[PDB]
Every structure is written in C-alpha cells, then in structure tokens.
Design a protein around this ligand. Structure first.
Ligand SMILES: Cc1cc2nc3c(=O)[nH]c(=O)nc-3n(C[C@H](O)[C@H](O)[C@H](O)COP(=O)(O)OP(=O)(O)OC[C@H]3O[C@@H](n4cnc5c(N)ncnc54)[C@H](O)[C@@H]3O)c2cc1C
Ligand SMILES: Cc1cc2nc3c(=O)[nH]c(=O)nc-3n(C[C@H](O)[C@H](O)[C@H](O)COP(=O)(O)OP(=O)(O)OC[C@H]3O[C@@H](n4cnc5c(N)ncnc54)[C@H](O)[C@@H]3O)c2cc1C
Ligand SMILES: [Cl-]
Ligand SMILES: [Cl-]
Ligand SMILES: [Cl-]
Ligand SMILES: [Cl-]
Ligand SMILES: [Cl-]
Ligand SMILES: [Cl-]
Lengths: 517, 517
C-alpha cells in the first residue's frame, strides 16, 4: 500500500494516531489486517492500484465526525463503507490507493422497525440477514427487499442505487430520511428529521426545501450514519412464476410484450429474463456438460435446456396480493406470451427438480436473503465476476441488439455469455455478467479489455451504465459528457463547497475535488 | 415597487436594457403590466412587501442563460416562474421586492409525449389544460395527474412538490430528467440526459453518480427549462367513490382504518377526507344556509349534510384497474369502514344531485383539469385562500388532535373551519384552508395572525409544513432547525457555490445567499 499522493508519513502517522484515540487502538487496522478490504475480484495487474492504507472502525456517528475532523486536519482521505460487501464493484477497496477505509460495520443498530407504518431506521452496519432475522424473531408482518448478495448493507446497497426483486426493488427509491456527517464534520438530518420532535422522518421523503437525500447516493458528499427505508407489508398472497423461451431470438418479441406490462405495473416486481447459462450456473457448472476450453456450443445448450427445463431465456416474476388480483394479473401476463412457439409457463409445483431456478428465485422475490446466487461464480471452476448493466429503452430491437453485441464479444474472448434483461419500471437493462479467473493475470487482462470495449460500444449505441466497479468509475463518468461534462463540473462545484480539502473518497463516481483534479 | 436592496437605478436600468436586447423589447414588462405578477391573495398590509420590479419573458433556454449571465453582471435578482399560477402561495410574486420576474410562460413546447413508454417531456410554459388537450387530440391512451388548479404548470407544480389525485399524485416523484440553467448561466442535464445520444432521459431517473434532480425542487439553485414526467397508461377500469361519516369525532377511527389501506396500497390514489364546509363550498355558499357573521352552528351543519348527502367528513377515493381487481380492493376498503355508525358509501350513480362533490372529484381522480375547486373561495362572498398542510403520522390521535387545535382557533377568529385529512402513502396531512376577504385590511391582519399561531402550535406538536406561501418561506424554514439549523447551513453552502452573486430568487425556501444573509 502506497501512501496517498500529497500526504506525508508524518501526517498519515499523526492521523492514524488520533483515529486510535477516537475509536480506541483496537479499531485501527493496518498491514496484515487490511487484506479483507482488498477487492476480492482483482481486475488490475498493477498491485499499486486500489490499495487501502489502513481502516478505522468507529462505534458512533460522533466518532465518525471526529474522524472526519481529523482527516481534514492532516489531509488524509477516507473511503466510507457500510459493511463493504460491494462484490463485483471492488468490495471495500478505494478507487485511490493510500485512502484510509472508514468501516462502519460496528454501527449496526436497528434503531427502529415500525410495523404499522412499514419502515425501518438502520445504521450502516445492519445487514439484510440481520434485519430479516430481527423481523422474523419479532413476528412483524413485513418483507424486506434483498439483492442477490444477502451479506450487503441495507444502507450501503441503497446508496449505490442497488436493486432487488420485490415490488420494493428500487432500494434508494424506498429510502426515507437520513443522517449525514458532512465532509467538514458537521452532522445534518434530511427531510422531516431536520425538524426536532417529528415522528415523520420515515413517513415523508421531502421535508421542505431542496430535496438533497439523492446527493449522498453514489457520492462522496458525505458519510451516511442513519437511514430510513420503507418496508412492504406482508401481502395477502404470493405466486412466483417462470416463463421459458426456447429460441435466442425470442427475446425481441418477449421484450416488446413485457413493455406495456411493466409500464402499467401489471408485473408488480422487476422483470428479469436471464440467459440459459446464467440460470444453469445456479445449479450446474460447465464441466458437467462440456469439456472444451471455449464457450459451450449450441448442441450443449440444447442438452442443458432439456435437463433443467430452462429456455435460452428465462423470465422470472411474481404475483403479489389476494388471489383474485393475482389471477387477473396472471391472465394478462400469460396471454401476453402464450402464442410464442416453444413458450412454457411454470409455477413452483410444476418444477420437477427440487433444486431449481424458480424455487431459488421464489425466495428472492419474497425478500428472503440468500447466498445461492454466488453459485454462478463456479461456472468455470471458481472465479470472480464483473457486471455491466447499462440503461436502454424497453424495446425488442434494443434488447436483441445488445444480446448480439455482447454475446459475440464475450464468446470471442473465451467466456460464456451470461446475460439478463432486467426491467425496473420504464427502464431496460441488458446486464452482462462475466465470470473470470481472478487469480490468473492473463484472464484479468482479457476481462479488463473486454469490459472496456463493451462499455465503449454500448455507449455509442446510447446505453449508459448506472452502477460500476471502483476501477471503472472515472470511465463511466465520462459517458455522461453532454456539454463538455457540464454535469460533472457541477458535481465538482458541490464537492469543493462541501469538501474543500477533498478528504472524502476521492474518485467515487469519478468526482475528485480541486486538490486531485 | 422598490428597487432591490444593494442595486442601483443605473444597474437595474442597464440590465433591463440588456434583457430587452436578449428577448426583444416586447417581452420586458414594467409599471402597469407588472400587476398580473402581484400576489392575487394579498396577505401583507405593507405595500412595499413582495413587489416585483419588472418581468422578462424569454423564448428559449439559451435566452434564459443570457438573462442569467446579465443578471450576474449587474447584481440584479431574478424570480423564475413557469406559468406563475401558484395561487395561495403568492402567485408569481417574489419573496423579496425589487426582484425581476423570469416568466417562462412562452416556453410552452410539448417536446415529446410517448405513449409506449408513458411519459412527456415539457417546457415550463405547458399547462395541464394544454397537455391534457394535446393528449385528447392525438388520442393517446394516457392520463395526466392534475392539481385542483388546472391552469398550473406541469413543471412548476412538480418543482414545488405539488400533488394530485391519481395514483400518479406525487408530481415530483414522477419527474424524470431535467434541463437546468445554473445560476452562473451554465446549462446541465440530469440523469441519462447527461449522456449524448440517449433515448432514456424519461425512462430512468438516476443516471449515474449523485442524484441531484431534487436539489432544483423548492429551490433557487437553478432554472429548470425542460423536465420529463411519467404518465399513467389509461387503466382498464375506473370507479370513483365517496364515503361519508356523520360525526366530527369519526375522523379518529377513520384515520386508524385508512392507515393499513394506504401503507399496503389497497387505496391506489391519495386519500382525501374533507370536512363538511370544504365540500359544501364546491356547490354552496354560506349565505344560503346561515345569515350570521360568525362560523356556522351545528344545527346548520346538520341541515347542510341532509341537503347535500355529505357527512362531517367526506372520504373521496378511486379504484383503478380491471373489474376483478377493483371489486377485490373495494371489498377491503368498504369492510374497513362498514361498522362505523352513520357511515354511507356512494358510487356516482348513487348520488341524487347532478351537481355534486363526487361527480366533480370523479373527474379530478382521473386526471381531468378543471377550475371547479376555486368555488370554495365563494363560501363567504368571494375571497382568497391560504393553506397549511403539515406532515403527521397516519394516526387517529394525530388526526383528531389537529382537527381540534385548528377548528377551535379558526372558528374563534370568525372563519369557518375548512379542513381535510390527506394521505399520500405513509404520510398524513391535516390541511387547513382558510378563505378570507383579501381586499379587507382587518381580515388580512387576522388571517396573518391566525396563520402564524397555527404554524407555531402545529410545529410544537411535531407537525411540519412541506409547502408554503412566499410570505411564510422563512418561517417554515425555521421549523427545520435541528442542530442549529444544520440543514439550512448546508443549503446556504450549496447556494453560495452555485450562485455566489445570489441572483436567483433570494428567499425561496428561506435560502438567501451570502450577500443578503
Ligand atoms: C453474485 C452477485 C449478485 C449481486 N446482486 C445484486 C443485486 O441483486 N442488487 C444489487 O443492488 N447489487 C447486487 N450485487 C452487488 C453488491 O454485492 C450489492 O449491491 C451489495 O448489497 C452492496 O454492498 P453493501 O450493501 O455492503 O454496500 P457498501 O459496500 O457499504 O456501499 C457501496 C458504496 O456506497 C457508498 N457508501 C456506502 N455507505 C455509505 C455511507 N454511509 N456514506 C456514504 N457513502 C456510502 C460507497 O461508495 C460504497 O463503496 C451483486 C453482486 C454479486 C457478486
Ligand atoms: C383552490 C386551489 C387548489 C389547489 N390545489 C392544488 C393541488 O391539488 N395540488 C397542488 O400541488 N397545488 C395546489 N394548489 C396550489 C397551486 O395553485 C398549484 O400547485 C399550481 O399548480 C402551482 O403553480 P404553477 O404550476 O404555475 O407553478 P409555478 O408558479 O410556475 O412554480 C412554483 C414555484 O416553483 C419554483 N419554480 C417553478 N418553475 C421553476 C423553474 N423552471 N426553475 C426553478 N424554480 C422553478 C418557484 O419557486 C415557483 O415560485 C391549489 C391552489 C388553489 C388556490
Ligand atoms: Cl419494481
Ligand atoms: Cl462432480
Ligand atoms: Cl395463480
Ligand atoms: Cl399515491
Ligand atoms: Cl341566490
Ligand atoms: Cl365496484
């Protein structure tokens, strides 16, 4: 780990000393204890890149504030993580080496769960597992909404615009109220929490005046120390389904049919249409169907589909509510797809495998945290992953163009194509997942190169990334370049106003601050 | 109209001159032509307050930018309005006298309406009437969501956190993408619009990085020149209803029953439970039931209820979707209230009056713009109104405490109590509307005083205002005072960074800028 540029050993040493006084000497980590904070899915081949210098683990908001005041005095940068499980995005590691990680794992109090109003107020350390377990224990009739990684932070995930698979799938949309330590060490509360004596912090997003909560998501404009989130009341009924399509070209008409269903909200959760290999790899690995080094051939695809009762495309969704509602919505959904040759429709009871994609996703779509999804990392013997999830119109043409662009490249590079088409509400994402051997330098180099080209080519077709790995944060920022990067010039203006010393997470979302820019 | 403090006649004159060059001499207004921009509902008795000095009406974004550059050179403040129909909030008038109004009425292009994706991209001048009429003409299967004032701006209303009465009732929540002229004259686009070549500006809110759209709502951080908004697909069915309650104390149990219905979204639009007089005054005036100068007595309330088939509380709501869905949801809603003594349930066909509250609200709850609501201003012979709409928990106790606090004061002051309980999703608002004779100085003084006391007393019970009249913008801002006004210190930090010369709308949301603070 290099020192961060511009920062002396005397400075970094005096700071680490004062941090230790603030949080106690037990909660300042260095040297050997810093490896948990390295990116678990190494992309770079240069070991001077994305290296944390140290980590400090405060117990409270006020300790966070003192840390930040100290960081300001010594010019030492901080990289805040809630729990730091941002796997595929860098884990807990900074964009910039020398950055001291601010690990808020120990701030894990569930401050409130309110059944009657359907919310929680949580600290950054609270995991999905913990919140879920708290709810189950108290018997509250509330669902949470989990990403495929159950170990993540409710806070951290939402601040990064993460998603899940219930009607409450847009995590940051369900955010309501936050406490923030600003980069100068001042503490503020957004919304109704700015009003002393309110009982409305988790009931009404705006409060009064400029709506600023969003500026602390995908941002280095502050450290979030408390955050509210809305929780769905247990519904009166729940039916998960899987609809399979046999032909790779079906995704065009499938996307066309999904469009009105999503816009009108007939489909109540995110639509996910996953490619064969991405779904297969939940229950199977490559060597069980194909011994070659290259991607699987069509004949092997067909075998896999026949074994697993999957298609080339697999649409998982769920119905929620009283049976009459669920039946009516299902009529509309099923009728939208029934005339496509080869289509098949499944509820859980129709699956003949007891370990099965639908049975797994059934849990995720009712907000049960699991680690099952990490299975796809075993596809080629064990590896890391990176994901590329640009936004596009919900159009057949856009869906199949991205499929064609991505699969051809990915397969040319020797990887299997693992993709899905995700629809939030009016937004389509073609999500590429590439599993690679992160221990092999030749494979990292190929991945890095493939990734860049995918990004470049997608951007030119008008498809921009909304969430990315620490390594590509600058690159993605350059996508949004209208009027000579006018938006990022504004971000930098706010950055310098709130963080003149540039001590919060230099490089996050490609925002640097005047000192490093 | 006084000059704005700190600004010379030479400066104000050179600026008005350069504005005229930018937009043409026809589109700079002064003296007599400035009266349309006065508050129509005068509250102040001091005619030096909230007076606009001049108004300038650009044709384009780029003209806006040149105006702003000129404003910066001469230190002349601007007050931007989309259409300036903010009736009950000041209309088009500035907080601070001497402020030149930036009227964007002529920027009224509907840039796009997309049926397949359910959105519009509009300029600030577009009215609800215009957008509605455009849709009807083209035969697009889309609803809009209108406030009770149909003459408002789709943009302006949303930026002020305005509301309506369909499922798309939270206007700023449905906002997606905006173009903004910053206070330095630079132009930026938020979200996917920052990415050149996107077709996704109105499909995905976030883009990448800090989510900043909200900072330009209830704000003087920029001028919005284009804005996207999501539009609901025409639903498969629509049944509006009215549920009446006979007793003033029923609102307690009514609010308790509404809570789970709203949180779970069984009620698909905003719930509005309006008091007798507020609903009566849509079709009747006071002198038709009572000749006294004071508020109506109970005996007269009873007569009105029996004439109009209204209760002391009137819950308007609507069902949306296929009949099976609507029936199922109605079963849950009706069962939630059926056991309350005196309760009555109406669909349109059950109303015996052809001019009737439900028949009016039926239109509003399917997004048809109307001016009918302004009828309540005739309650006591013709007047203005002001509204007070603080947030509270959805609780019977909170509902009836606010009813008791407000009605007693309002009636003591000689006004009739006109109130409603509004529920967005998890948020209750007790909304006080007070109709007053705006031409009478004694009545203005009483109103102003009543308003202050209501605000003070509500704040102490933990109920804070989310939207207010230009006159009370500072006052409401002081509500949100946690940690020595930490939030507003942050607002002011951003204000000085984006607007160092303080030329955009000094005082909006009680944000002033370093020059005037
Ligand atoms: C197999 C697999 C499946 C995945 N599935 C999903 C999925 O379905 N949905 C999804 O959203 N993601 C998914 N991910 C990505 C990721 O693992 C999750 O999003 C995870 O929840 C994020 O980590 P975290 O919650 O611990 O957040 P953190 O790592 O704590 O935070 C993420 C980032 O947010 C910022 N941040 C966090 N806390 C603060 C704070 N208090 N103040 C300021 N900034 C802060 C920082 O930039 C930080 O680096 C997946 C990854 C893998 C490998
Ligand atoms: C009887 C009655 C009923 C009402 N019912 C409702 C209702 O149901 N729902 C509701 O929401 N309101 C309601 N109102 C309040 C108000 O009339 C409406 O909200 C109206 O739609 C707002 O005016 P406008 O749309 O022309 O916005 P504008 O007056 O153009 O804008 C409002 C404010 O937003 C800011 N602003 C506007 N445009 C920009 C921009 N481009 N850049 C920067 N800042 C900008 C300014 O501060 C401006 O003063 C009601 C009022 C009355 C008297
Ligand atoms: Cl969704
Ligand atoms: Cl084996
Ligand atoms: Cl079913
Ligand atoms: Cl709503
Ligand atoms: Cl008459
Ligand atoms: Cl019905």
């Amino acid at each position: 780990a290099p020192l961060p540029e511009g920062v002396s050993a005397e400075a970094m040493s005096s700071a680490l000393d004062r941090f230790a006084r603030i949080v106690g000497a037990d909660w300042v980590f260095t040297e050997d204890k810093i490896t948990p904070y390295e990116d678990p899915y190494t992309i770079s081949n240069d070991e001077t890149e994305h290296r944390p210098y140290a980590a400090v683990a405060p117990a409270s908001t006020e300790e966070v504030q003192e840390i930040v005041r100290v960081a300001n005095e010594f010019g030492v940068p901080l990289w805040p993580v809630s729990r730091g499980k941002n796997f595929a995005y860098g884990g807990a590691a900074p964009v910039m080496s020398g950055t001291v990680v601010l690990d808020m794992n120990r701030m894990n109090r569930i401050l409130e769960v309110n059944e009657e109003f359907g919310y929680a107020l949580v600290e950054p350390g609270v995991s999905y597992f913990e919140l879920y377990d708290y709810i189950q224990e108290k018997g509250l009739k509330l669902w949470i909404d989990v990403p495929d990684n159950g170990w993540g932070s409710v806070v951290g995930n939402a601040l990064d615009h993460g998603i899940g698979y219930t009607p409450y799938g847009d995590h940051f949309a369900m955010q309501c109220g936050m406490e923030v330590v600003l980069p100068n060490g001042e503490v503020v509360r957004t919304g109704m929490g700015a009003m002393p004596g309110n009982n409305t912090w988790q009931l009404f997003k705006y409060g009064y005046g400029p709506y600023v909560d969003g500026i602390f998501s995908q941002s280095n404009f502050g450290v979030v120390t408390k955050m509210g989130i809305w929780l769905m009341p247990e519904p009166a009924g729940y039916r998960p389904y899987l609809i399979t399509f046999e032909n790779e070209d079906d995704i065009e008409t499938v996307t066309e049919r999904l469009r009105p269903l999503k816009v009108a909200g007939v489909i109540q959760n995110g639509a996910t249409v996953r490619s064969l290999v991405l779904d297969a790899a939940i229950t199977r690995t490559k060597s069980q169907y194909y011994d070659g080094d290259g991607p699987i051939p069509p004949s092997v695809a067909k075998t896999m589909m026949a074994d697993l009762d999957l298609g080339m495309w697999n649409f998982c969704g769920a119905l929620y509510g009283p049976p009459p509602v669920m039946d009516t919505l299902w009529t509309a959904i099923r009728d939208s797809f029934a005339d496509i040759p080869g289509v098949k429709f499944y509820f859980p009871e129709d699956r003949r495998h007891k370990v099965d994609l639908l049975l797994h996703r059934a849990e995720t779509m009712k907000g049960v945290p699991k680690l099952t999804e990490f299975n796809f990392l075993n596809w080629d013997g064990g590896g890391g992953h990176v994901g590329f999830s640009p936004v596009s119109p919900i159009t057949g043409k856009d869906a199949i163009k991205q499929y064609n662009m991505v699969s051809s490249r990915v397969r040319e590079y020797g990887f299997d194509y693992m993709g899905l088409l995700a629809i939030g509400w009016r937004d389509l994402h073609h999500v590429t997942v590439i599993v690679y051997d992160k221990t092999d330098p030749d494979e990292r180099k190929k991945l890095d190169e493939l990734f860049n080209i995918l990004v470049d080519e997608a951007a030119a077709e008008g498809y921009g990334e909304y969430r990315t790995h620490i390594r590509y944060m600058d690159r993605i920022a350059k996508t949004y370049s209208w009027n000579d990067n006018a938006l990022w010039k504004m971000h930098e203006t706010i950055k310098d106003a709130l963080d003149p010393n540039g001590i919060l997470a230099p490089g996050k979302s490609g925002i640097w601050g005047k000192n490093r820019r």
